[PDB]
Amino acid sequence: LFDRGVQMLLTTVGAFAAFSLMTIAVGTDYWLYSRGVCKEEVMTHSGLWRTCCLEGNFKGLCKQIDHFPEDADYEADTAEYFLRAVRASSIFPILSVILLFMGGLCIAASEFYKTRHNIILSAGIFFVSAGLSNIIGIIVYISANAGSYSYGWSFYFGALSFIIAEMVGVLAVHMFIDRHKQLRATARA
Amino acid sequence: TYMRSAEPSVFVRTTAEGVARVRKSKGKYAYLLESTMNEYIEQRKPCDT
Numbered sequence: 516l517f518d519r520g521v522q523m524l525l526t527t528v529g530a531f532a533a534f535s536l537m538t539i540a541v542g543t544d545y546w547l548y549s550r551g552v553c554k555e556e557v558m559t560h561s562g563l564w565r566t567c568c569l570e571g572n573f574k575g576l577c578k579q580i581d582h583f584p585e586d587a588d589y590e591a592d593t594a595e596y597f598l599r600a601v602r603a604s605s606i607f608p609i610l611s612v613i614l615l616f617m618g619g620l621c622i623a624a625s626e627f628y629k630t631r632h633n634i635i636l637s638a639g640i641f642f643v644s645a646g647l648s649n650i651i652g653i654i655v656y657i658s659a660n661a662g663s664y665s666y667g668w669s670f671y672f673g674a675l676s677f678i679i680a681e682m683v684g685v686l687a688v689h690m691f692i693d694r695h696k697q698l699r700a701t702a703r704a
Numbered sequence: 705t706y707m708r709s710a711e712p713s714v715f716v717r718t719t720a721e722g723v724a725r726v727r728k729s730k731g732k733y734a735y736l737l738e739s740t741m742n743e744y745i746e747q748r749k750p751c752d753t
Contacts, residue, residue: 587728587729587732589729589730589732
């Protein structure tokens with residue numbers, strides 16, 4: 516909002532924080548708190564790949580998530596199959612992870628070859644797209660849930676990583692406006 | 705002719721396993737049984753038919 520060095524530092528630290536939070540969110544098996552089984556129904560903490568027990572006779576023995584359950588899964592329509600494929604493969608959380616990493620690389624590499632004026636816009640677009648991918652992934656995960664529960668901290672880790680990415684993306688493109696604004700100012704004089 | 709071409713065979717050896725396939729299908733299988741017996745189960749346990 517003021518100066519450039521701090522604003523550079525603020526954007527970089529925000530991008531790194533968003534990347535770390537989102538990477539933790541993807542790799543943490545604490546997304547959903549619901550009653551279930553880790554092999555009778557009991558309190559379980561779920562993620563995207565494994566779900567263990569809480570307050571159970573054994574503690575911390577997860578299984579692979581039954582993305583395609585056996586024993587008469589009953590099948591479903593093409594849209595439901597598509598949704599199950601997205602939820603199982605987690606393409607949107609991972610795609611957002613990739614976009615966040617790419618934007619972090621772009622902003623980090625901006626300190627090299629300052630002349631190229633589209634790398635910062637590329638970083639901003641990458642961060643904005645990562646935020647949109649976060650929205651889509653959260654929505655698809657919650658929809659797959661509905662198919663007494665509470666969400667784990669890692670789900671809220673990935674919820675704030677969308678807010679930070681958009682606030683980083685807002686600043687990143689804002690830097691593109693001002694640094695291009697200087698070009699007109701020096702051209703007029 | 706469909707039960708001839710129904711692979712796997714939809715025929716049930718006993719009347720107990722006929723309803724058993726129904727409760728394990730969740731609306732994907734229909735059972736042809738006597739009407740008097742049918743009115744029993746629809747009020748009998750597990751009250752899902």
